[PDB]
Design a protein around this ligand. Structure first.
Ligand SMILES: [Cl-]
Ligand SMILES: [Cl-]
Length: 30
């Protein structure tokens, strides 16, 4: 299952979208 990450997805994940919450954009990583 995916995670919202800052600053970037970790190794083995790709970004598919963006999370917007708690005042930040997050990489949506799966
Ligand atoms: Cl998982
Ligand atoms: Cl980001």
């Amino acid at each position: 299952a995916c995670y919202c990450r800052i600053p970037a997805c970790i190794a083995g994940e790709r970004r598919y979208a963006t999370c917007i919450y708690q005042g930040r954009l997050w990489a949506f990583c799966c």
